[PDB]
Symmetry: C4
Subunit: 332 residues, 4 copies
């Protein structure tokens, strides 16, 4: 009844406060933020940038036109040649700035060979133009390609279960791929979250404790086509070792599950997460099979993914008791 | 005689059904799909987008021209200035929209300083223009660069063999690189696939079982220039431990082989796969050498890659028997 | 009192000298440098490139105009057609070159069907134009996206502490994430730096010695949301094994701490670093908790991140003594 | 005296022959090749593509102009409007095609509202135009960014040495970073190459044998600022175990050394290689220190990198003898 540190969607429930350097540290990493903001903001931002360069140069050109005396003779004649043809005022100067930076260049307003400063400005503005474009491309490219989007076609079981496999008592949860694209170099991790006090009397607000999914033997690496059921064998070195079915409806703790892997197309690691509270773990259940064979191939029924069935055959005590008891019977 | 879970090309034989959230989960990951569809579709899609913005703006301009009364005086005179010169109708309005968004800007149809709304629209459309381009670039860039294409210059042997190496009985298959480019940080994995029932009576439609290629000792990492022969030593902890040559023509199971590595040029992980059925494994054979030395260098003959030869010297029983028997003789 | 090999910001304090091949080796890797230089330099560089192609082609066109005799008849008539209309001199030839390469193409200066060489040149220059753009985009894209920028939203504690946890004496330092974005596949490393002489009398100017953070058990991998305290248990195989609280104010050595992980958005590994001198390590202290629970969620107070408190309960001798002593008492 | 499998530059000495599917497998991976070819080829290729689309469309337009009867009335009048203004022939049709696809759009040749087919063609060509650009960008971007270029600022010692460290006999070679940029998540690998015959009489043309650099303890991971000396301790499980100083001037084999790591700026793994023949290994030597301290910092003299000095104190027998002998003395 304490609270949820990671929601079921993987979303983490926490907030940072009194971060001192936040503004100056965010300026240096500035690109990283820019790509996480809503599109409309990233866009409006860029159109803001465009608009600003158009107005700036537009003004310069208008200033030049004003001083040269072009405003009064925009088209020139035999005895007089303007800096930029057909700039009669502000809006005209604005239009030419846009036409130039965008490279539309209708040509009705046009630079002449007269002013080196007008020429120069055109030069500068062109270069400027490319620069802004380049940033926009990259930004869009980057944001467009974010691998965290892939985590939404990855799936966790609504519950985790505990049950026997091959003589061992195991915590299990299930994972699945909702795309026919592969998750490359995928692997998993699990952790038990809960506050604790060390024998020295040190309070750890939330301690994160590894749940061994087979990392040592290289078994945490998975090949995920059909849903895989992930197994934690509860043993001497397990944090759940002394926990029984009744300890599940009493205790407060949380199990955090991770799936890391690479989006096949971009080879960019995505990390998917979810969470099981002690009250979301079903003791004595087993997952319903989603895979079955038909004729020339295999199929997965995904409506059975979350479903579990009761195994009355399941022991209600902790692995600890289970073990210790084995050594009474076997001891006498 | 059951069926093949992964084809020989690496293609997986399975299909997902009754996935509930598929539409809304695919919208969030939408970029990931977009790059896997056939070119013509991704392209037609984008030309569809272009076409749509040209028509949309074209319409706006035509509406503006209509209301301003430009349709009747497209070129204007001393007493009258149009919003956009030379828009006499729909097609004219269309052309200007394209000329503008594409930045061709022939200039025959041209914005004037008269309408702020025409100007604004031009502004908006330009910005819009960049945006669509940017998406196209990224999409093409991404799709163009997909690392899974590299898996087609990587190679597996048509068969796997079992045979003795240095006193040990080993399952072996071969892998090869068809490019002179390196596969960076490459490593392998193998798995035995087959359905099973746990001693608790739990049916696992297909259980995936690790075949140890040396992960523990860091030996699953390979340096692949010439074809490497991959070895699984069949021992106490091997899933093939109790399997003999006769069990091979009887049993139904499958071995799945993986090669993961990085495309040298892009450093993007590609994953190559293939499969050996118990009936594709040749007991008592050995691979033909594809590498030989000549003068100033080494050469690889790839026509010998798949070829195997008989070793009548090979034991036909399981590693299990082989071991157990050693301990009769050595026991008496 | 020797010196600092890595500053606290992670910056390494060292310089390379008498590198022989530096110029020719840097030319081959040239792209890598280009993206690390200040913007203004990368930009000025590119505008330098632009400017150079505009002048080059501008000259060609002017040469062509000169020879054709266009300088004297820029607009032509019934009996004479220029190579490029309206090029009356250098600046005119310059303007057309820019208009062409930038694709502004106002159109006042325009190629005609007369000179195949003018046409060809236009062809060449256009192609050239794209090429330079493409480089600029990539450069900007690349530099824009550098993952090392992310290391500035990652955090280390100003000090490291030594203290007891669960019956063991541990060196600890703390790490934190200043963004709500995740650090994917993150893990840590630590090293003791100091010069030494092997029993063979070989001097190692600075030897780098692994500080075990749990790599073997897969515990060096972390899930970083709230600040994690990193623990080195000082034991038989620890380089700090024979060090006590008094050895800390005497000895000269340095501990180097690393955090490697992936920027969530780009999946590009960043590496963060910092350093603790023996004089920056606080013996007998403990970190102040930055995480606390409120109602519907958790919060982190970052002003407590660096803060430590005294634990007078802490032993002042080395793990070595501590152990050895245990085996007097337990031995008698 | 056999031959070198990897040259000292890392270049591998081998060639593939009789690869059967080479053309069709290379078509699918086609992008991968495109980026490894010389610039001039990738460029000429693209200019080839451009040129081809300009000519193609140019022809279409000319065909349209021909049929419409524009060739005879390029500028039109009150009673007649051309498809595209000012196309009088082939070259004119060519110019307009280029002006259109490049978006220069001088405007002297210009589409009119008359032909829907001309309009359509313009539409199509524009779209086409973007597509080719996009490919070019990506290609240039990709090729520009190749991480294998970084391997040229990474360094190996010209020789490897064997010598005692802390009571153990070790094969050592040295590695170095020629840039002030870091090599992220770097690690090493080594291998002994030589042909062999298994006790079963199976010939392995070249067997690749792991040289343990500490992978098991996680010590193959390095932090490379100053040059690191890499150590292989020659022990029971070492392939060099039974090799002595005299076996070095006799035997033929090769040691292959690898350094894998990530370019700091792009986080793209590069793999550096080199090789030591038994005749390139200096028994009884030690590397000259390249690092020294001065005042406020550290410096590296790179001219000392390759240099080694004699240690007459060094044993000339194999680790094997060395060990076995220890157990005579200690045995009697
Ligand atoms: C015309 C200008 C129209 C315009 O400005 O934006 C419209 C549209 C919506 O973007 P919008 O501003 O609503 O921003 C997204 C919105 O919040 C989504 O619901 C988020 O998904 P999720 O719920 O968090 O998963 C997403 O998160 P993330 O993606 O930031 O993580 C946000 O970016 O943007 C396009 O799709 C590209 C259109 C290209 C044309
Ligand atoms: C003009 C417009 C012409 C046009 O629209 O497409 C033509 C052509 C064919 O593409 P197309 O639509 O046939 O799509 C590809 C086709 O299915 C291949 O056979 C697939 O290879 P594989 O058998 O699965 O290995 C490939 O798979 P993947 O690549 O999706 O995985 C598909 O993309 O596309 C270009 O090559 C780029 C041309 C650039 C100009
Ligand atoms: C107009 C032309 C204006 C122009 O030429 O540059 C201005 C500005 C400053 O760049 P500038 O030349 O000062 O170069 C950066 C400056 O040294 C920063 O302080 C560095 O940060 P840090 O202290 O090392 O962390 C940074 O390091 P790194 O990033 O190289 O590592 C340097 O690149 O550049 C833009 O931001 C993009 C503007 C886009 C418009
Ligand atoms: C104008 C058109 C001029 C033009 O077409 O090319 C000139 C120039 C040379 O390229 P070039 O054709 O000589 O091709 C490179 C040449 O072989 C290098 O010596 C190679 O380096 P290395 O010895 O193998 O290390 C390199 O290998 P890799 O890079 O393929 O691995 C080759 O690409 O290309 C540019 O630098 C970009 C210029 C941008 C303007
Ligand atoms: K234009
Ligand atoms: K134009
Ligand atoms: K243009
Ligand atoms: K124009």
């Amino acid at each position: 009844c304490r609270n949820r540190f990671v929601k079921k969607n993987g979303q983490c429930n926490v907030e940072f406060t009194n971060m001192d350097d936040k503004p100056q540290r965010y300026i240096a990493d500035m690109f990283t933020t820019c790509v996480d903001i809503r599109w409309r903001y990233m866009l409006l931002l860029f159109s803001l940038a465009f608009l600003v360069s158009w107005l700036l140069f537009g003004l310069i050109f208008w200033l030049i036109a004003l001083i040269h005396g072009d405003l009064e003779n925009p088209g020139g004649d035999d005895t007089f040649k303007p800096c930029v043809l057909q700039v009669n005022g502000f809006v005209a100067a604005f239009l030419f700035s846009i036409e130039t930076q965008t490279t539309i260049g209708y040509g009705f307003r046009c630079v002449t060979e007269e002013c080196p400063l007008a020429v120069f400005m055109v030069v500068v503005q062109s270069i400027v133009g490319c620069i802004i474009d380049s940033f926009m491309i990259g930004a869009i490219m980057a944001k467009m390609a974010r691998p965290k989007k892939r985590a939404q076609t990855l799936l966790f079981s609504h519950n985790a279960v505990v049950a026997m496999r091959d003589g061992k008592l195991c915590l299990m949860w299930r994972v699945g791929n909702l795309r026919k694209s592969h998750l490359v170099e995928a692997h998993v991790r699990a952790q038990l979250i809960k506050p604790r006090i060390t024998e020295e009397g040190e309070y750890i607000p939330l301690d994160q404790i590894d749940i061994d999914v087979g990392f040592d033997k290289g078994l945490d690496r998975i090949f995920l086509v059909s849903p895989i059921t992930i197994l934690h064998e509860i043993n001497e070195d397990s944090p759940l070792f002394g926990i029984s079915r009744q300890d599940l409806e009493t205790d407060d703790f949380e199990i955090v599950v991770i799936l890391e892997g690479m989006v096949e197309a971009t080879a960019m690691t995505t990390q998917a997460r979810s969470s099981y509270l002690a009250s979301e773990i079903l003791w004595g259940h087993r997952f319903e099979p989603v895979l079955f064979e038909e004729k020339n191939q295999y199929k997965v029924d995904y409506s059975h993914f979350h479903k579990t069935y009761e195994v009355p055959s399941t022991p209600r005590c902790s692995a600890k008791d289970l073990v210790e008891n084995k050594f009474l019977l076997s001891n006498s």
